């Protein structure tokens, strides 16, 4: 089946963000919804969290809707969906032990024993094993999303999304980043919506692909089925080139009036 | 021009008016609901650190500089007529009625006011609010409520302490330099002031004021745009406001009991 | 409701069936230091869904069962623990793959 | 003896570098080429964002301070037969104590404030490294217009404090509970002198200028370039400048009035 | 011929040190493209060419002449040369675009009124930021602000543009504007670009001598086509974007029977 | 260094080098040397950069307002190379 929303439409005071756009993928499978920057792909998994209303548009999560339920109903399905940001999400105040352990010390009745031994094998899953009394200021940009990750898997979710990972890192840490959601979802089995714009970083283990352009969705499929696509929207965003769309200048005069006056 | 300046003018009336709207509805949907005191009691000494005990440098060693300067220039305009029995009072009547929780609020909106502004407006810009409330109970009831009911506690607990030192500051002045026989300085003071006129009226002030600046103090962290430039906007705007709260509400409370 | 454990010891032999959550461990968490008195065998046959939650409470049950000198394994385990074995990196001498 | 208990360093040489800094760099804004043509938009420029806008919670936070002054001066001067002299406690106190501190607070909180953001937010998206870096110095470019606009805008900002302060307390004194304005005026126009209340007024209100002003400028200059560096460096700019405007007026006061 | 050659610095910072011993040569109409994990001095390695930073031990000279080895106001006349940008797109915010680029050459050049209307809508027209001149920087987006200063940096006609990170966190549509601009730049002025970017696929079909800056050493000084076959651990693992190699990622520190199961 | 113009009435021999500093005497001085010449000689330059290609268009422009086709003759490979990439159109610079 299909967990995110079906047919919605957001609109903000002045400029708008989505006009009749569709998402379906299924239980267990990657999907990466692409586009390019300046448009709402934060905006996009906060609708399936219920952070916001949409103005037209309806949110199917697993026979249930996202704007039409309760206060008392949306923190039920809150409990398994661990959304995660880009930058880091860690409280200041405590350490890398207490973050994993948060969503742990108020939800799960495990006692004091048994909830030092799952946060110490949480963080070894991300690599963050040693790093567990250091504090999230002392920790890199890299660091820090592997410690959220450890965090997002805490409630043991099903429904994991990604906002923009590895966006400004370096090639060493983003192939980590790449291969810790491998090792998630082969060995748990957890849906994960992941958002970027960076092609060949994210065509590789996802098995669905979304391209929104001019706040609508141009295109789908897979991601060896996006390649073999002629179009002229989608083959402007995979395997970025200057001309197409875009028409690469700011709409101005006749070049006689500014220059040369 | 009548329908430009009506709707300019009529943009700013909406938007004022939304903006009490969600300072409304942000302080009652942190104080109603389920009582939680044995989840907060760990979480309100943990902000009592940042409010009390973190301000009280900045009260301590500028309560002998006002009790210094008051006791020095209530000095000399009084000896034309009687040297002893003074500096009792219009020193500590002056620190119970005026002085004393309006001194200490511009104080407390400066250090503490503009401290749990940038606060709220770091953990908004870091992502720190929504995703408590995308995994766990939402951060209204959470670090809003043990942060608003530090301030209304702290403010009334540092004006004693911002009265007590000014009352022995303003004794320096007057006893070991220049004396001017310091029994006389005792036993007509304490004549002067008087329980609910200068004693428990202080205090009435010190709640009053504690509630109008942590309110703004935990409203512009709150309703700052996500960014480098919104929190520092909003940190001017706290001690902007606060000041218009404070000597604002000083010539309300003035009429009404004095 | 699924959420049980319904542990039955028959003196060498602890067949944990029901579910193994992150809430039922608590009856079984307080009656541990009778299930690692001179048992030797650990069957989990009737599970079908083992978490981290369980897995933590899993581990104690061997750990425990070592400072009094046993020889616990595992008869019948659903495939679902070994591959979150290699996902937490778990060591020798703590698990038993066969 | 070596360890934190006695030699625990870091507190002798840190926090005197900072003051090394700080002299540095009001040298070299301040010594150079004279470029009066050149930072003659400058000076208009910044004159708005510092004297300007700082005028508004100067206006009518001075009805408030000054109606609360006859409101005080009132109850107190009953049994004394003082109720001609109600101009003796409003423009003495806001001509000697009111005044230039209570306006430096208001220029710390606004003015002080926004000149710590507006230089940590070039430094955080090195505005000012891309400034150094075209062949001209960013001292004497964006801190020198700021530094004499902050200069000249608290004298002229503490006589509207003063003028309005006046006047709320002939709103509150005059108008209300029945004084003449023969016995109100007689009070202060051949009462007090010059050289005591006007001269000393002005006196005290450039050096609160400049240690405002110069304080405002080393927290936004001296700053880690982050999203938490600017808003704990205005923070820190009004916990230094109420240390700074109390702490002198201790020491301003030694000479004049007695 | 060459312009800074990269003698041995130093640059110990107190605590921790940032370079052990370099050697990053620029030659002159070529693209010097210098790529490193992050978390290391790749901002601060463009501070010492540009002069903002003296350095600890050795020295560093620009065309012959030696940066920390000169008065004051012979380094203002050779940092106009150069017109370095950042990141983060470090434009004035109390003007718009068109005060921006003419910002450099009004107070140094002597160009009058119509002859400096003239000269900026041709900075702006290479970019493609003609019609945004009348627009206000806190308006513009992530991807236009590099291009303003862009134009503003090729105002005075440098000769060693030195790119702070450019397209470090961009759309790929973005990403294929800067790529393009500095190939239209290089070959038309004849101006050397410095690139200290970790992108690999991206930098790399642009530049001539691409240098790897790993553990604070120069361990590949190959071409753009000769470090594909560099039998290196260091350099294999910055490339191709793999996990696991000689910079660990389990972070070993502790016994695992001692924090599991206490 | 300078820039001496050998104007003889139907060449505007420009000699020197146009670079950012040198355009004052011939910014000012540009009303009689418009007065119907048709050509524009640019033989004795080599470095043309920006700021005197915006001196050069404005003698051509004003060429045009009495009705006067410009021909460059021995013109340098710097100016042909800056003009596509400023994106130069037509009927201001003759290629
Ligand atoms: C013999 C009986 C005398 C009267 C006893 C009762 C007096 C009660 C007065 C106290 C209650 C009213 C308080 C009003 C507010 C006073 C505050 C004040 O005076 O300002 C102080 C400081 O004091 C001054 O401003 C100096 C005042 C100088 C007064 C000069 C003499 C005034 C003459 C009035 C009496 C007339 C004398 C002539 C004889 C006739 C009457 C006997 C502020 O200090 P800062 O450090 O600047 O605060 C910073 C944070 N806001």
């Given at each position: 089946?299909?967990?995110?929303?079906r047919?919605?439409?957001?609109?903000?005071?002045?400029?708008?963000?989505?006009?009749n756009?569709?998402?379906?993928?299924?239980?267990?499978?990657?999907?990466?919804?692409?586009?390019?920057?300046?448009?709402?792909?934060?905006?996009?998994?906060?609708?399936?969290?219920?952070?916001?209303?949409?103005?037209?548009?309806?949110?199917?999560?697993?026979?249930?809707?996202?704007?039409?339920?309760?206060?008392?109903?949306?923190?039920?399905?809150?409990?398994?969906?661990?959304?995660?940001?880009?930058?880091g999400?860690?409280?200041?105040?405590?350490?890398?032990?207490?973050?994993?352990?948060?969503?742990?010390?108020?939800?799960?009745?495990?006692?004091?024993?048994?909830?030092?031994?799952?946060?110490?094998?949480?963080?070894?899953?991300?690599?963050?094993?040693?790093?567990?009394?250091?504090?999230?200021?002392?920790?890199?940009?890299?660091?820090?999303?592997?410690?959220?990750?450890?965090?997002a898997?805490?409630?043991?979710?099903?429904?994991?999304?990604?906002?923009?990972?590895?966006?400004?890192?370096?090639?060493?840490?983003?192939?980590?980043?790449?291969?810790?959601?491998?090792?998630?979802?082969?060995?748990?089995?957890?849906?994960?919506?992941?958002?970027?714009?960076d092609?060949?970083?994210?065509?590789?283990?996802?098995?669905?692909?979304?391209?929104?352009?001019?706040?609508?969705?141009?295109?789908?499929?897979?991601?060896?089925?996006?390649?073999?696509?002629?179009?002229?929207?989608?083959?402007?965003?995979?395997?970025?080139?200057?001309?197409?769309?875009?028409?690469?200048?700011?709409?101005?005069?006749?070049?006689?009036?500014?220059?040369?006056? | 021009?009548?329908?430009?300046?009506?709707?300019?003018?009529?943009?700013?009336?909406?938007?004022?008016?939304?903006?009490?709207?969600?300072?409304?509805?942000?302080?009652?949907?942190?104080?109603?609901?389920?009582?939680?005191?044995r989840?907060?009691?760990?979480?309100?000494?943990?902000?009592?650190?940042?409010?009390?005990?973190?301000?009280?440098?900045?009260?301590?060693?500028?309560?002998?500089?006002?009790?210094?300067?008051?006791g020095?220039?209530?000095?000399?305009?009084?000896?034309?007529?009687?040297?002893?029995?003074?500096?009792?009072?219009?020193?500590?009547?002056?620190?119970?009625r005026?002085?004393?929780?309006?001194?200490?609020?511009?104080?407390?909106?400066?250090?503490?006011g503009?401290?749990?502004?940038?606060?709220?407006?770091?953990?908004?810009?870091?992502?720190?609010?929504?995703?408590?409330?995308?995994?766990?109970?939402?951060?209204?009831?959470?670090?809003?409520?043990?942060?608003?009911?530090?301030?209304?506690?702290?403010?009334?607990?540092?004006?004693?302490?911002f009265?007590?030192?000014?009352?022995?500051?303003?004794?320096?002045?007057?006893?070991?330099?220049?004396?001017?026989?310091?029994?006389?300085?005792?036993?007509?003071?304490?004549?002067?002031?008087?329980?609910?006129?200068?004693?428990?009226?202080?205090?009435?002030?010190?709640?009053?004021?504690?509630?109008?600046?942590?309110?703004?103090?935990?409203?512009?962290?709150?309703?700052?745009?996500?960014?480098?430039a919104?929190?520092?906007?909003?940190?001017?705007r706290?001690?902007?406001?606060?000041?218009?709260?404070?000597?604002?509400?000083?010539?309300?409370?003035?009429?009404?009991?004095? | 409701?699924?959420?049980?454990?319904?542990?039955?010891?028959?003196?060498?032999?602890?067949?944990?069936?029901?579910?193994?959550?992150?809430?039922?461990?608590?009856?079984?968490?307080?009656?541990?230091?009778?299930?690692?008195?001179?048992?030797?065998?650990?069957?989990?046959?009737?599970?079908?869904?083992?978490?981290?939650?369980?897995?933590?409470?899993?581990?104690?049950?061997?750990?425990?069962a070592?400072?009094?000198?046993?020889?616990?394994?595992?008869?019948?385990?659903?495939?679902?623990?070994?591959?979150?074995?290699?996902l937490?990196?778990?060591?020798?001498?703590?698990?038993?793959?066969?």
């Open positions: 089946n299909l967990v995110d929303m047919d919605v439409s957001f609109t903000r005071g002045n400029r708008c963000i989505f006009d756009i569709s998402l379906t993928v299924p239980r267990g499978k990657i999907t990466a919804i692409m586009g390019p920057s300046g448009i709402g792909k934060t905006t996009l998994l906060r609708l399936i969290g219920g952070q916001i209303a949409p103005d037209h548009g309806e949110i199917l999560f697993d026979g249930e809707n996202i704007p039409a339920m309760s206060r008392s109903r949306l923190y039920t399905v809150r409990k398994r969906m661990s959304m995660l940001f880009q930058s999400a860690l409280f200041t105040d405590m350490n890398v032990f207490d973050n994993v352990a948060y969503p742990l010390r108020e939800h799960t009745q495990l006692p004091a024993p048994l909830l030092h031994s799952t946060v110490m094998m949480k963080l070894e899953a991300v690599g963050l094993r040693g790093a567990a009394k250091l504090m999230p200021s002392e920790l890199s940009g890299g660091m820090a999303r592997r410690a959220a990750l450890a965090r898997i805490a409630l043991e979710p099903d429904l994991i999304m990604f906002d923009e990972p590895f966006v400004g890192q370096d090639p060493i840490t983003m192939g980590v980043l790449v291969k810790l959601i491998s090792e998630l979802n082969s060995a748990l089995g957890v849906t994960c919506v992941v958002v970027s714009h092609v060949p970083e994210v065509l590789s283990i996802a098995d669905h692909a979304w391209i929104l352009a001019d706040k609508k969705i141009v295109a789908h499929g897979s991601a060896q089925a996006l390649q073999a696509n002629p179009d002229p929207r989608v083959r402007q965003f995979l395997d970025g080139i200057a001309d197409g769309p875009v028409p690469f200048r700011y709409p101005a005069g006749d070049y006689h009036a500014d220059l040369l006056p | 021009m009548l329908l430009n300046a009506l709707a300019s003018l009529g943009h700013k009336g909406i938007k004022t008016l939304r903006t009490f709207g969600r300072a409304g509805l942000m302080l009652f949907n942190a104080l109603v609901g389920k009582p939680e005191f989840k907060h009691a760990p979480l309100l000494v943990r902000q009592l650190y940042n409010v009390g005990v973190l301000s009280m440098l900045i009260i301590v060693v500028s309560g002998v500089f006002i009790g210094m300067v008051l020095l220039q209530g000095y000399l305009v009084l000896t034309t007529y009687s040297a002893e029995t003074s500096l009792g009072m219009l020193v500590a009547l002056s620190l119970l005026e002085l004393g929780p309006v001194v200490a609020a511009l104080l407390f909106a400066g250090r503490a503009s401290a749990l502004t940038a606060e709220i407006g770091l953990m908004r810009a870091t992502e720190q609010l929504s995703s408590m409330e995308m995994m766990a109970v939402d951060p209204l009831r959470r670090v809003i409520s043990p942060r608003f009911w530090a301030g209304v506690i702290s403010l009334p607990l540092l004006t004693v302490i009265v007590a030192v000014g009352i022995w500051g303003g004794s320096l002045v007057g006893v070991s330099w220049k004396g001017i026989d310091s029994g006389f300085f005792w036993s007509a003071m304490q004549n002067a002031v008087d329980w609910r006129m200068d004693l428990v009226n202080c205090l009435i002030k010190s709640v009053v004021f504690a509630i109008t600046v942590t309110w703004i103090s935990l409203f512009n962290g709150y309703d700052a745009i996500p960014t480098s919104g929190i520092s906007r909003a940190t001017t706290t001690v902007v406001h606060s000041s218009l709260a404070v000597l604002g509400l000083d010539f309300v409370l003035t009429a009404l009991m004095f | 409701m699924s959420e049980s454990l319904s542990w039955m010891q028959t003196g060498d032999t602890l067949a944990l069936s029901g579910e193994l959550d992150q809430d039922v461990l608590l009856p079984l968490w307080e009656m541990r230091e009778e299930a690692v008195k001179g048992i030797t065998c650990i069957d989990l046959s009737r599970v079908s869904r083992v978490d981290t939650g369980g897995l933590a409470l899993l581990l104690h049950l061997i750990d425990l070592k400072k009094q000198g046993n020889n616990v394994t595992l008869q019948g385990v659903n495939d679902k623990v070994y591959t979150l074995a290699k937490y990196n778990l060591p020798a001498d703590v698990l038993p793959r066969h």
